[PDB]
From a paper:
In contrast, HsORC2/3 is composed of AAA+-like subunits, but with no predicted ATPase activity. The resulting electron-density map was clear enough to show a significant movement of helices in ORC3 compared to the DmORC structure. In addition, the position of the WHD of ORC2 would result in significant clashes for two of the four ORC2 copies present in the crystal. This indicated to us that the structures were suitable for docking into the HsORC cryoEM reconstruction. Moreover, Orc2 and Orc3 were predicted to contain an AAA+ fold, but these subunits do not have the residues that are important for ATP hydrolysis and thus are predicted to be ‘AAA+ like’.
The first step in genome replication, the binding of the Origin Recognition Complex (ORC) at origins of DNA replication, triggers a series of highly coordinated steps leading to the assembly of pre-replicative complexes (pre-RCs) in a process that involves CDC6 binding to ORC. ORC and CDC6 then function as an ATP-dependent assembler that first recruits a ring-shaped MCM2-7 hexamer with bound Cdt1 to DNA, and then loads a second MCM2-7 hexamer in a head-to-head orientation, whereby this double hexamer is topologically linked to double-stranded DNA (reviewed in [O'Donnell et al., 2013; Siddiqui et al., 2013; Bell and Labib, 2016]).
Numbering used by the authors:
A (entry chain A): 41 to 83, 97 to 164, 188 to 506, 548 to 606, 628 to 657, 676 to 709
B (entry chain G): 284 to 466
Write the structure that this text describes.
Amino acid sequence: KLRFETYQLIWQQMKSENERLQEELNKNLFDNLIEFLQKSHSGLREIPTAALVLGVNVTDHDLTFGSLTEALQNNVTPYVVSLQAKDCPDMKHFLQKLISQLMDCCVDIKSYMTVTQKTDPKMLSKKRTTSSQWQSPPVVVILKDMESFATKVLQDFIIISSQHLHEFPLILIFGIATSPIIIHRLLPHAVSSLLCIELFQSLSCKEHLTTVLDKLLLTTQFPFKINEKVLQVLTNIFLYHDFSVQNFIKGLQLSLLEHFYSQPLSVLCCNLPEAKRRINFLSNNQCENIRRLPSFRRYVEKQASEKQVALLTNERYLKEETQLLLENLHVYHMNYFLVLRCLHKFTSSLPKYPLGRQIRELYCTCLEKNIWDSEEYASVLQLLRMLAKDELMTILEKCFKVFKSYCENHLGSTAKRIEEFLAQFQSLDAKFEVLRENVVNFIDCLVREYLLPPETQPLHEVVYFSAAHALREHLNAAPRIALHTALNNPDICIAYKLHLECSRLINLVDWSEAFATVVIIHARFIRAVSELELLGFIKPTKQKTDHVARLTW
Amino acid sequence: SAELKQLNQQYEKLFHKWMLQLHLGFNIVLYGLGSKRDLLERFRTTMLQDSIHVVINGFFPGISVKSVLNSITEEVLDHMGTFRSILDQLDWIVNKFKEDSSLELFLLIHNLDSQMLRGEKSQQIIGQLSSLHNIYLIASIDHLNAPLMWDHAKQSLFNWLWYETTTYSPYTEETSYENSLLV
């Protein structure tokens, strides 16, 4: 459906820019991987190594190991190989893949029964293929997990390869999460030195989170927006549970799609002309549908006479007034983001961060409830009225070097309010100036331009997506809520009441008989209990003769 | 006697939707109180229907992950009995599937909890298969520790769409196999 053409559009635009920005956040770190590796190649029996710290995300970075295979085959410098630790229980498979992989690193770019490989032919490839290069290749042996390396295996290779060295100035990259102490644990001290490491850093999930939100979901490019509740539940699944931008992305598709099956009313979700084409295509059923929802009904409530029926009956004055609702709508959202970034360099500099720190936070709290109505905001007020002076004039002049950088580059508007602010702050650079700019940030921005989700234009539905609960059923995977509350709240209901009641351990003499004091009548409790085994609310337990006892709390 | 049918009907409206989810690479999941047999077999009579629907009941002790991959590969897939090493098996079935495209195979497992499926190898298989896009997975779970055995790598390999699916029906053919001591 049109929304799926829009899906793949947005979708692969998203993972596209994600993988590219992955490649740039790389590029400083990878230009520093080949700049480090070319610093040690710039300047016996010791393996130098490269230690990269990738916090606790697995599959997203396999891309960039494919791209180290590639990129470090590209400089004309090394021929690179990657040894996985789980591939690698014994001492044989590493030297086998060692060499399989540097005879192979010579292959893939040209465009047996693999048992045949052993510890010789690497020592031959940078001898036989090239003994005289003359400039030796690194083979950065990407040990993608060195943490899971078998320690016996680990020292046997760092000692075998170390002993053999400088015929093979191996460097080896470390896929890792934690800090240096843990390497110094699994890799012994003799190894900590043989490795000659220079510690390196790689960016984790949470940064890619806050980045991607600031960029992607909060782009003005794509109209789609999220309600407080699936934003809260999502960023809760990300922050409180699983840190993968993988699960947040797949969850963001599932949000994208999930909404995009809500109702056709989003076909108007597109650029004003892309949407207005759809306006033309609109038919009388949809005319019924816009006649229905609130923020339209609300937009209908502050209305008038006939006019109102040429909304309700004669569709033309509506579809005109749809181009009135929607044009405005996609005007408002721009007027927000322009202004949201604005807020950030103001308050992202600020301490206490009571309202928020990261851009995603302000988006969150701003949209959750009235910033004005919240007192932590007023606290931030008191702060700005306190700081004053040059901290503020520097940070604010950076709000215009940088936010006039946004409206110079990041954002086109051109809204004419922005410009007025801009002139105001130029004039300052040359207190109640800070409080009329903040009051401008208050009445002219927070009051006006930053405003809420539900206080917004008509039709804030379908661009902003409600219905959090079902996704949490379809993602968060909360079976024991529905179970607990179901079995609690009826012969299996009463059965779980007994399985709550009796004591701790319940003897089947006086459990079959206590369930006969308390309660065809038996078979349903043995099926309740055999399920409660299969379910798992009990177990068929031997702690006492003929007993059923729960592992679950 | 009256109520259950309506619910087993309501879930049917998600059905086509699940089909689309099945296209998108995810795999639906039913956490019920009861049995989805009439609903999963109505998913066989209503949605799946068609062809290439593999059925292995996990409360059946009879079928086995090796004979699961045979039962998929022997009759329905028709290619062969799956070769000794299951990784090689899937390499042949896949070099058939990676080569032969656009073949969608819908598999419905009652009670993944098993055995035989307890093996981390068994769910490295189901992990790869249900990770392999051609086929798709609808599992019905009971054991409270069912989410226990699914790790990060597997709940990634299984992209699980979890559904209310609160089901009131027995647990008759699921209940026929379990034996207790009063008899």
